[PDB]
Design a protein around this nucleic acid. Structure first.
Lengths: 75, 65
RNA sequence: ACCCACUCGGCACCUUACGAGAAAUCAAAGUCUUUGGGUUCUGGGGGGAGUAUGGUCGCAAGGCUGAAACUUAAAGGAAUUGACGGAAGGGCACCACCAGGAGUGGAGCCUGCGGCUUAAUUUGACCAACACGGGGAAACUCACCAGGUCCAGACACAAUAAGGAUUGACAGAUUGAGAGCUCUUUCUUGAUUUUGUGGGUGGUGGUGCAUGGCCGUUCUUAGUUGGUGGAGUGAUUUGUCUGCUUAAUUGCGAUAACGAACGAGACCUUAACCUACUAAAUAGUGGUGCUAGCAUUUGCUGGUUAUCCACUUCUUAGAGGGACUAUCGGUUUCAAGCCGAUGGAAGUUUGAGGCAAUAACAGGUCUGUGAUGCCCUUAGACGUUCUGGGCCGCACGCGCGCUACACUGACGGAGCCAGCGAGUCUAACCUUGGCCGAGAGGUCUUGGUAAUCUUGUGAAACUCCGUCGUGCUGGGGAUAGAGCAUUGUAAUUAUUGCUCUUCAACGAGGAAUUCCUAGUAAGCGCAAGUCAUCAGCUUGCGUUGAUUACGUCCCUGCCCUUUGUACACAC
């Protein structure tokens, strides 16, 4: 058995690198001139999701990110 | 033969040397006369008890009681 | 003429070397480093080469005399050990032959090997490879091929980094894939990581011609080796041998050897005997013993320590016994032994195995190993996983095999007997019985972790009665079509099983060539290994059971001795 050089018929495939979003949580809260804070995203109805899980906003769904659950606006 | 299973013990060890592996085999035959299990001698070893023969007597006698 | 004793001269011979020699050997080849009696001739590593040239003799053939150039590290002598011999002698082996049996080689198929083909058809091996790698591969196995994931990147350092080094992911695109592989909008996580440099780790990657271990073979033979002594300058030799004997370097013996060691033998396992011991409801047997069935002078049975009482012939397994060639006859030169008969369960080492020396082989294995050196690779991996394919492909050649060519048979019915095994709660193993089904199978239970049940494994050849009737025929069952089941995630390139249908070659097989001497060959099945399924394979086991020969060295080889050698990589 003699091995030969490995040639590839398809180009190389680069591996995913984590997307760097600088200071993401600031766009998840808002405070007024008084000081009261409120959240810009709803939370997971599932108990083992977290009160600050901050369901992501997508085109037509809300995605948990930890529970991997998808909710809608019309519920 | 069976006296190998009785009186021979062996062992093999691999020795990791810088150039390779050296095999070591040790074979030991213990003296059959020792130990307290199985046979105490080789199968073909024969011992003869010395007769301890005495001199013959000439006068018949009785030791009555 | 002969005999005896001398003597001179001669051809020689035998023993031994005090001596000589490199030794073979030598009475000269001695009186030679303690070197000188007289004298002639010849040689100076091997070839070129007794060649060229000149001279000379000869009728000629040729004789005598006789270089150089050039080339080369040995050539050569005598012995030693081995090996070899179409050398001799003595033994031996059915992996030899003889007398034979059963075959194989011829047919179809199964399986391994080469070749061809291919994306790959992974690979090792060529008596001592080729149903071998326990290699009966759907996935796995897997080592190959087309692709897709992951790091299972220890540890250290530098860099980045909670103002986030990094992890994962719903949906869609993409993809063989419902792999967030990678994208498209964004959530989660939080120093565990990431990047670079060193270092590791894995590799069925290479090298068995770097190795360990194991295995095979030389070699199934009887062979092998120290000590002290003897011979030789020495390598080495003797011991370890003429003869006889033995399966045997087994012994009787002989003896410059003596005493030893290994191997052989002894030993161990298994098979055969024990009316003798110890017993047994997980083995059996008996009891007008108990109970009950059938047929009538009582036989065959069913439940029997769980419905009892005895016993150990059969079965089991502990302890033992038994054969030691015993007795007798013959024969050898007493002896070692050998032959025959008797007795005996057994008289080939009682049968068969297990174990098994020294020295080896570039024998096989790196693809058994977290045995392993070195080299190569190490994130687009040769690491590890997933899907699919391949290992099985087909003008062809070879090896091991299965089924056959029929009447000493095929088919049908009936009869009807083994031994060696194995089996589940660390879960689905061995399965009786009942029911359904033509079958294969399905289903409800049941017993068994087992001398208890499967199982008396009611196996198959075999026996009886019948059909067939010498016709490639009801011999043979290859190939092919259709359907029904089982195992499994998956059965297509048919896993296997079952049913119906098609019904090929083959009429006993050239040259050749294998195995075997008694419960053996051969026929016949069964269990185990493999294993989810698959046994035309192997390892064992039993059932039925011949012919032929108790020999030889013709062939092929083996052992010992002598002998020759220009061989030692050893004909």
């Amino acid at each position: 058995k003699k091995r030969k050089k490995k040639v590839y018929t398809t180009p190389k495939k680069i591996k995913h690198k984590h997307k760097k979003v600088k200071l993401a949580v600031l766009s998840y809260y808002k405070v007024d001139a008084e000081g009261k804070v409120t959240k810009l995203r709803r939370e997971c109805s599932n108990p083992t999701c977290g009160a600050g899980v901050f369901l992501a906003n997508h085109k037509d769904r809300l995605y948990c990110g930890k529970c991997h659950s998808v909710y809608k606006v019309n519920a | 033969g069976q006296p190998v299973n009785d009186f021979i013990d062996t062992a093999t060890r691999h020795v990791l040397m810088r150039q390779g592996v050296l095999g070591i085999k040790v074979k030991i035959m213990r003296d059959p006369a020792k130990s307290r299990t199985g046979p105490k001698a080789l199968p073909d070893a024969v011992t003869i008890i010395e007769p301890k023969e005495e001199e013959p007597i000439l006068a018949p006698s009785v030791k009555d009681y």
